[PDB]
Design a protein around this ligand. Structure first.
Ligand code: CA
Lengths: 281, 290
């Protein structure tokens, strides 16, 4: 019934029901958005559950922590055990055959409000395991609609992304593709790619699953600025994230992308994605 | 002894001791930095306490909420009342003559994690009243030291960038980091930056004149009372380093003179006449409201 979550505040840890998990009001994640997050997908085959790419996800988490000066509270083994206990404790909540997504957040901790790093704060850690519903077959068959709007760490200072996500909802679209000074940046909660003349293109920059899949398929990858015209004239437009896997974008601001049908680089990357998941299960 | 704070979560409200105030983990303030804040100075004449420019602080709070679509949980009177209950509840823990600063934070509330606005979340309100030590008579005589670094108009709690810049100042033994983007002055990590050049007061431009008037209202008022011309105009890095005076303002600092910059003196190293006048004007604004 109720989700069970993990919370560590002032070095005290507990797995508790969601309705009992609360953090002190002076936690810097709440006061300042001063924290980082990472996600790990957990794919289910009956009662067999297996994290996908947990090493690479945890390595990006350690990097985000260091980039903002926050003491990493666990080594890799400690993080994996924290994830395994959390997933175990939600076995009933989730149920057999149910994929999950694990969300991990670490903030600089609790102290008197002052912008600079406090001398003696201990990091807060929050994690939870939620049901994951992947995009449907129909969605992959039809593709998704994106809109555009004016726009290197996974921080929780996310107001910008919240606003662009709301913008996409208000426009009946799956995602807002952002443009800064005429060039593509990213989605509100996804990475954006285009295909042109058989070449996979992303904006200029490691966690790099999509590049690894492109390398596997023998698809050439270039990292360069993608301007608004090149976006609108793409052969294909793609979204990627832990929860979306890869989705084809077939409408962009009410105009069709190319023929308005998912293309072959999408197909190739999607199949290579699923083989990497089979490999791990 | 211990500060007493206001917390409203899922339509339940309380005044509780700081150490008893906790928010749900799925609050979007904690998960997404999805909220706004506003601070109100409370000045003390003995046991007498008075909020400074409460109407203007509360108008900015309301704008901040409207700007990012959070339903404002109070009209102005509701907010006024909330600030009074809170200050009154901390009278004893503050003590006589002790100035305070009220911090109000409003987030979009608690819900299942998803980026877009949740249908049923109700905004969370947190407020506290903390002792305020104004910059000393010394600090005003010596002036303060800023550094520069490489660097829009929402007062949000997505403040990681500001945190990093504040820490950069601390690491270089400086009171503030003055940010530059494209070679032009933006702002401090938690303060607004001004320069004086040939007796004219200059502030960086904002996105449009409306936002400039909201942001600069108090200093614009002080400058007018002093007969000091003010303009909102780009300050390039060389203009910043050649300034006659450099100034910081915020709710906690009031106005301060910057007399050193990246370890070099600002002119003589002495606070200057436009600072003196504005500071005096600031103090007459306080006295008047008190
Ligand atoms: Ca199928």
């Amino acid at each position: 019934i109720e989700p069970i979550v993990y919370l560590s505040v002032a070095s005290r840890e507990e797995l508790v029901p969601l309705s009992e998990a609360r953090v002190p009001v002076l936690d810097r994640g709440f006061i300042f958005g001063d924290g980082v997050y990472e996600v790990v997908p957990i794919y289910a085959e009956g009662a067999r559950r297996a994290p996908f790419r947990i090493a690479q996800h945890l390595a990006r988490l350690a990097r985000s922590l260091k980039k903002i000066g926050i003491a990493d509270p666990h080594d890799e083994a400690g993080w994996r055990a924290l994830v395994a206990r959390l997933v175990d404790a939600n076995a009933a909540a989730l149920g057999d055959g149910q994929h999950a997504i694990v969300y991990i957040q670490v903030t600089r901790g609790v102290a008197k409000r002052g912008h600079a790093f406090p001398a003696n704060a201990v990091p807060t850690v929050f994690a939870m395991a939620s049901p994951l519903a992947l995009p449907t077959d129909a969605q992959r068959a039809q593709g998704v609609h994106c809109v555009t709007a004016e726009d290197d760490i996974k921080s929780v200072s996310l107001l910008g992304n919240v606003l662009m996500a709301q913008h996409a909802a208000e426009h009946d679209a799956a995602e807002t593709i952002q443009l800064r000074d005429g060039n593509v940046t990213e989605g509100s909660s996804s990475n954006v790619w285009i295909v042109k003349n058989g070449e996979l293109i992303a904006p200029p920059r490691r966690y790099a699953l999509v590049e690894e899949l492109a390398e596997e398929c023998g698809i050439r990858f270039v990292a360069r600025e993608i301007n608004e015209a090149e976006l609108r004239a793409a052969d294909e437009i793609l979204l990627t994230s832990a929860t979306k896997e890869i989705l084809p974008v077939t409408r962009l601001d009410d105009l069709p992308v190319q023929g308005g049908r998912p293309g072959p680089v999408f197909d190739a990357l999607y199949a290579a994605y699923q083989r990497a998941k089979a490999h791990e299960m």
